[PDB]
Symmetry: D2
Amino acid sequence: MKGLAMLGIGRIGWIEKKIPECGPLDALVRPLALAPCTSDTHTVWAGAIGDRHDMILGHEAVGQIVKVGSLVKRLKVGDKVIVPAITPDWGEEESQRGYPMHSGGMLGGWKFSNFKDGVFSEVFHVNEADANLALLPRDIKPEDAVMLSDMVTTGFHGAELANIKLGDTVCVIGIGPVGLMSVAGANHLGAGRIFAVGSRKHCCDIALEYGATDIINYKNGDIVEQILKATDGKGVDKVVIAGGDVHTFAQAVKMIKPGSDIGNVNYLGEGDNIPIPRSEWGVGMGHKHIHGGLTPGGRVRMEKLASLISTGKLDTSKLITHRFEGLEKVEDALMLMKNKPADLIKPVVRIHYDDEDTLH
Amino acid sequence: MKGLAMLGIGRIGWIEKKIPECGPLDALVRPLALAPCTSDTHTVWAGAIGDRHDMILGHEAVGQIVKVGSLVKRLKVGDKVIVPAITPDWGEEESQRGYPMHSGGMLGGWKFSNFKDGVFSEVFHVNEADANLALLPRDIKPEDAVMLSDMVTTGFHGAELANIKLGDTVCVIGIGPVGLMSVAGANHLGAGRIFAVGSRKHCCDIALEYGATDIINYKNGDIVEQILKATDGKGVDKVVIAGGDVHTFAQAVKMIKPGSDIGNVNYLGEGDNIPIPRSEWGVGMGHKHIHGGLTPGGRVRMEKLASLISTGKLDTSKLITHRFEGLEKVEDALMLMKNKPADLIKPVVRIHYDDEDTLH
Amino acid sequence: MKGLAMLGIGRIGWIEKKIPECGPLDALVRPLALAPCTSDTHTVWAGAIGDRHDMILGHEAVGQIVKVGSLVKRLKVGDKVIVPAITPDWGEEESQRGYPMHSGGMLGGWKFSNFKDGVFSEVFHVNEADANLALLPRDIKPEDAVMLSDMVTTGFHGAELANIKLGDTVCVIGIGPVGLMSVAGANHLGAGRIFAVGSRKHCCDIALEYGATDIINYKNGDIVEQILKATDGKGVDKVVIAGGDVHTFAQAVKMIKPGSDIGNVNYLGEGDNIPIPRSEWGVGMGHKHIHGGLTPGGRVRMEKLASLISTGKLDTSKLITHRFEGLEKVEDALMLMKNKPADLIKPVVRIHYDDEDTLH
Amino acid sequence: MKGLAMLGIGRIGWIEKKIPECGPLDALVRPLALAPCTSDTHTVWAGAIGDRHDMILGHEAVGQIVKVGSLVKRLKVGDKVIVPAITPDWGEEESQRGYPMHSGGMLGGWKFSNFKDGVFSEVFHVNEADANLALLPRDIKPEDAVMLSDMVTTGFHGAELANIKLGDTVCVIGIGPVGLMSVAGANHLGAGRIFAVGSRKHCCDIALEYGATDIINYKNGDIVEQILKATDGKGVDKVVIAGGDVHTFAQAVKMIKPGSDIGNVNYLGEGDNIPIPRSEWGVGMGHKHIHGGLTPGGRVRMEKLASLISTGKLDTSKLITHRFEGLEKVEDALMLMKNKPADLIKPVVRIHYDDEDTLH
Ligand SMILES: C[As](C)(=O)[O-]
Ligand SMILES: C[As](C)(=O)[O-]
Ligand SMILES: C[As](C)(=O)[O-]
Ligand SMILES: C[As](C)(=O)[O-]
Ligand SMILES: [Cl-]
Ligand SMILES: [Zn+2]
Ligand SMILES: [Zn+2]
Ligand SMILES: [Zn+2]
Ligand SMILES: [Zn+2]
């Protein structure tokens, strides 16, 4: 089979691999809808998580089951599924202690395009398929559902980590597709005033559609100073970090009240250390709690989030700026995430099969 | 000064009381908008919290400061304020351990029309005024803000106590004004499917406007059966109880999943015991957590909830069914909470003064 | 193979069952030390969880692996293990949402002697063995370790559900082996004054050894009145219920402060309803949170608790009052739990094999 | 009245100040036992929280009431009290949202020797005295109770912020008196294996007495390496930081598991930034939560912690290494904190009055 792989730091290409073996608890899946992610960009071109050799990329898919292991009970060949980017080993120590996204070791639940061949191939492998795949509800378009795999769940996790409470004033730093979902997540957790820090017109517009109330554009001056002026020197209640670099944490600390939470979901591609400013962190004692977490995954997470789409309470189609057709277009789609044109949020690639509606 | 008082069980009337003494941390307040509460109907006609002698009624007000004590620093004569129903003693033991609504003893933070003269008088007294009074934002009508004092905060507290998470399926039992605000609160905590259990059409339909997705009317059969059928026997993730009686808890237990939360905010006015069904409660072990709590109060609670109105994220005007003018009409309004017509959610009474805009 | 079974409500006896099938993730285990539980007396003689036929009893074992499935990675034939009473299906919906003891439905993680053949047989079956079996540390006696399976974990879980904080005054109601472990759990969560409500003399004496400070014996008068007198009317901070009947909940609510937690781990064997007193529960609003939960299980829970024994911080030997040798003696041991002589806390049965130290 | 003050960065001496004005909620207190703190050495000699003008030092006292305001209800002249280092304004915003130690702004609840005249004077002032002073239990020596003000509460807060669970393996970094209390705090939250990092022999032995199981001395190699050995490369579950410098955080991040908590209570006296290592922090995604908090204070905190002494479950006497008599000797005692001999944990100064037992 064919897949789009990381050949080495700074190098991608199409390669052939064997179809993966399906064990008793596994499923093999063919992609129906795919999206590329900024994270693969860091992994490939920054080498942020080490070198790789012929690792198939991608971790956002809606798919169709082509094979199930003998112990699979919830799924059958032909079923259409939402594939979460994080597919935990549910019995591992870290899962038993409440952190299934770190199953088997830090980031161990994030398999696809971390250290396991990802979803950009004709067939891919899902471990613990019953636990890790949600059936696609009939009222959700595949292109909308592929936003659940990573964008919705990560952006919402940023808001969860920021411990957002009813009526909180919140700042979301970085308004790419993950940040726009942190704006939506903060709004869904009861935030009132929401500052969205970004400068791309189309991203800023979308942030307002998801519940942002204030756009903070760095071209109008230091963003911390803008936030402080807007809040009469008091700062914000909670901060979500969904973009930027290691220096964004100092900005979050400087703009946030004491007794508060900073929720990072940004994958940090470079820099030895994240500098936390001593004085503004209350010289160690300001209760400015700092969180940085990988998204949850698995089927329950997908089902809960899908229910917001099905009930008309979450519209993920706003994230989709480019629509492609055919597996080969994932290469174009991924390059868009590297190049970042002004009109871009997320591309989606749709793939059709001759037996998509009869496969069993 | 005149106030509408409970003169004993089943008896109300206007009485004259001295203007209360204003100590260093206190303020005296005149009403601008007032609303009656079903709780005062329980108190007066059912004797649900014991007999009272000459206690002024009412605990939902927007007001205007007429006097402040010597140590008050945030308020001045003439300021317009949102008065919360619950006005804690912030340094008491219960406050120090995170339960300020029970300051000084169970329900101790609920003073007005519990054991302290309430807001239905020409002037009323607020303890710890800097802590307990929020300024009325210039963009909120007094009639809309009076819903913050008790309806919005209590309804939202039901949703907080039910521990609602992103994508949860929720049932709210009881759809009077508190129940409607529990639906709104559940929706603002990220609920997906929300079942609202009530029968009167103008309440049921307003629930849909606040985020309900399913209306359950007991006239179509047992509401537990209806909810189970709707969820294919799985039940709902979380339940808020915002009305009914002691037997509503058994319904909540029978319709909810194991590993769940039941958040009650209903004031139970009769019955020796609340029966919890042993078998459906997992014979003691189903992790169906049962919570029953008095609303939070004080200035911060009001300020946070008000910000949801100011940002256009909450409309409380839909709760108001009747609009009266003049302090005397609190008597007519309270009598409506007692006679319970089809027309009714909440009356509000507006009171005007010659120097309403010039007092200083 | 021989096992001791519930043949019907009120009837037990030895039966023959086929050696269980061992699937890819499973292990087959032979018992090395076993203990009987009060729960099995409720199940058999009270019919508290419905009728059963031919169900092997028991859910407390230290055992030795005799067979592992083809995908078992952490365990080998011959390994000595602590078997938790609760052996979850870690990928089921409930596990993914943080309640693995309810995997598959309420109480679903409690398999042994609930709806699956338990540990009182020559060989028994463990699902998801890598996830559910802890290796027996070399410095823990099998008889001390068997107290981890259910007594320590359930007792500690009562303390966890009671949300015990540093310096809290706590009451544990019911001082059988589980309650004694709730005393020990409360002490290990930082409780200061601990009241232990019991009347079997030896249980009372042992409670003082595990960190109780005040034995409350009903023969001295109403236990609620005693605790209210001892706390000059203010009540206790938190309450664990580890014994008694449905009416024990009313005692907990009457002795506890508002803004507090009642953690129940008692398996309730009869009564249609648990009555919660309306007035003392703050007429629905006292924030007296009521929790009732099945113990955690799996290997992580066992490993954590076992580390308290290995570090010299928990002595479970004080629980053992009766010692037997030979598999047949589990019948004698279970009959003690039914009859409850004054002498009794917990019996243990030791089983030996010729190749106990050589099996591989 | 005489007091020992910071006269400027690097300078201390005795000055005369006016006996403070006692408002309606205030009390004036004379010292009976006093202790110096490392924090005052950072403040005076490192200028870690800015320059100060004539600020009386000290924030650890057992005292006796000499004057109470007209609205004080729990205290009378002559009463002996435990004075917490932190004395919140309980009605401020931060207190209302659960962070009373930040009342009025970051570190605002820490008044004594932060920005308010401290306890090293003949008389000092306590705001909100009913809320902020605990009566000294008759069974606790003044020298032992003075350890509650700051050492016990801050150390225990370190363990609280580190979110320690039953059976967790914990590392406490820094074993001065606050660190010894973090060890005790961890043991009182149910930790099993506890690693105490320090090299001073007397401190190391005392750590073993408070529940440490392993002592990690840096002279035997990089402490991160030592801890990873002893945990078979998996790391510890939780880390408390109770000493060191800004570089200690990187050590904590490197020794801890993903899905974990680092609880800092150390007052960081120098360095622009705290570097968090990007890779070992899971490239922003490891769920290694970082907390840094000022101790709780007020009466309830002191009463709960004092109950641990009164019940025989905490011995603070082991912290006292030097004993002085007479108010003058607080200068000598603070100088020991600055020069730190091998001999030292905490000095205490006892102050006697002719009417100590007769004042009313
Ligand atoms: C939000 As991700 C799975 O690209 O680190
Ligand atoms: C303050 As109320 C019990 O009427 O919501
Ligand atoms: C496993 As049990 C209900 O006997 O503690
Ligand atoms: C009150 As302190 C910062 O010396 O622990
Ligand atoms: Cl002090
Ligand atoms: Zn991604
Ligand atoms: Zn009311
Ligand atoms: Zn049992
Ligand atoms: Zn100090």
